[PDB]
Amino acid sequence: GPAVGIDLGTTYSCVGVFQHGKVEIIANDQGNRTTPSYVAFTDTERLIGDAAKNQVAMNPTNTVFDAKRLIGRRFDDAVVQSDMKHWPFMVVNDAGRPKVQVEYKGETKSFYPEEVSSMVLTKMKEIAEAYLGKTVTNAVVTVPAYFNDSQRQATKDAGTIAGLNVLRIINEPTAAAIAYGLDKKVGAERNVLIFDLGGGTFSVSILTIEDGIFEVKSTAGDTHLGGEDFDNRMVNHFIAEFKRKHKKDISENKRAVRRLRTACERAKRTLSSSTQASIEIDSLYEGIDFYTSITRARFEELNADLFRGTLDPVEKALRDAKLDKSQIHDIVLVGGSTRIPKIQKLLQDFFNGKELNKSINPDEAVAYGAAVQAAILS
Ligand SMILES: Nc1ncnc2c1ncn2[C@@H]1O[C@H](COP(=O)(O)OP(=O)(O)O)[C@@H](O)[C@H]1O
Numbered sequence: 001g002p003a004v005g006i007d008l009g010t011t012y013s014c015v016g017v018f019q020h021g022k023v024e025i026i027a028n029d030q031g032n033r034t035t036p037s038y039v040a041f042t043d044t045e046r047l048i049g050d051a052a053k054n055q056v057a058m059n060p061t062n063t064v065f066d067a068k069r070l071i072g073r074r075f076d077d078a079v080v081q082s083d084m085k086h087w088p089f090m091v092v093n094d095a096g097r098p099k100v101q102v103e104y105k106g107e108t109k110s111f112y113p114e115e116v117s118s119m120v121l122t123k124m125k126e127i128a129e130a131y132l133g134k135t136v137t138n139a140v141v142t143v144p145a146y147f148n149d150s151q152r153q154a155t156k157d158a159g160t161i162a163g164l165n166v167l168r169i170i171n172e173p174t175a176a177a178i179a180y181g182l183d184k185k186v187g188a189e190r191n192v193l194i195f196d197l198g199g200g201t202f203s204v205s206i207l208t209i210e211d212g213i214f215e216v217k218s219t220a221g222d223t224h225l226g227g228e229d230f231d232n233r234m235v236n237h238f239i240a241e242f243k244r245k246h247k248k249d250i251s252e253n254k255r256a257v258r259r260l261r262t263a264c265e266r267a268k269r270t271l272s273s274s275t276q277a278s279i280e281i282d283s284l285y286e287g288i289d290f291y292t293s294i295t296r297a298r299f300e301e302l303n304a305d306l307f308r309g310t311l312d313p314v315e316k317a318l319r320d321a322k323l324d325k326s327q328i329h330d331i332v333l334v335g336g337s338t339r340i341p342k343i344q345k346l347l348q349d350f351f352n353g354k355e356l357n358k359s360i361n362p363d364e365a366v367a368y369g370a371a372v373q374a375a376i377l378s
């Protein structure tokens with residue numbers, strides 16, 4: 001059976017396989033090429049992926065996400081203490097280790113973060129198997145460059161309990177470089193910049209490649225900046241508009257808000273290709289149907305400061321690595337958010353017109369590289 005490459009992401013995961021010299025990003029049951037890192041527990045079942053995300057506004061306390069933020073970490077971790085203040089699900093301490101507590105089939109159950117991630121890992125695996133028409137065993141799973149040994153250990157473990165034989169854990173920026181073939185030996189040192197703007201995490205990494213050997217010279221970014229922050233700005237904008245037209249504040253109604261957010265995220269995706277998108281929501285609050293729309297222009301100004309601030313981590317990464325803009329040879333876009341036109345303009349302007357590597361879907365780049373790496377290791 002072919003070895004596969006898996007991008008176990010904070011908000012979205014993706015799986016690819018290298019066959020016949022070509023890499024293939026496998027679409028799921030719903031036809032999507034990336035699937036949410038969501039797990040939901042109900043009275044009758046355990047939902048994973050799209051099915052899980054497609055019901056979060058109905059089962060908030062029992063729909064788990066952001067497990068990547070917990071994995072390989074302790075409960076006493078300041079990160080965890082901060083993070084949990086925003087999760088609708090419970091996180092309990094267990095001999096120092098954090099566990100997520102949910103209600104499955106009427107009974108109260110808790111899971112270790114690596115158990116949650118294995119659930120997502122199993123979903124990717126079954127997706128691969130359904131496509132390949134054969135059982136998948138060996139795999140290469142990716143992890144951020146800043147993960148310590150504990151976090152990598154836990155990610156590896158999430159793999160074993162999923163029935164996956166993890167051939168190797170490689171960094172996400174490194175996987176992105178390999179996808180574009182920037183790992184080939186050209187008898188010279190090459191500086192590559194990875195700009196990763198995903199769903200809830202932002203990471204900039206500068207890699208130096210010589211004779212096939214990578215070297216993460218610098219890294220910067222924000223663990224709490226991603227495509228979700230852009231959705232929120234849209235939401236706040238519409239919560240205000242609704243109040244104008246219908247003099248009703250839907251803030252308190254968690255369901256109205258979550259349904260509006262889903263419509264915003266989708267409009268956002270459209271905005272990367274069109275200049276305007278319509279928001280059509282039936283019976284948002286009470287029996288009022290919310291029919292409206294946004295323009296790319298307005299979208300851009302609602303997120304202006306966020307988009308712009310994206311350059312700060314870029315400057316920092318540069319000075320740490322001790323390099324000038326002119327010294328970086330290649331720039332590769334990773335993450336779903338990099339499909340945004342204004343982000344591409346902004347970065348290009350910063351690197352004074354330099355060409356951006358973006359022929360491979362940024363949200364598939366990591367999986368793609370892992371799949372190639374899985375291939376060589378098998
Ligand atoms: N066309 C698009 N325009 C803007 N954002 C997009 C587009 N397609 C996907 N996204 C966003 O990408 C994010 C997911 O990014 P991804 O890199 O897949 O996640 P992760 O950070 O989990 O690795 C979401 O915020 C989603 O809205």
Ligand SMILES: [Mg+2]
Binds near residue numbers: 009010335
């Ligand atoms: Mg990612």
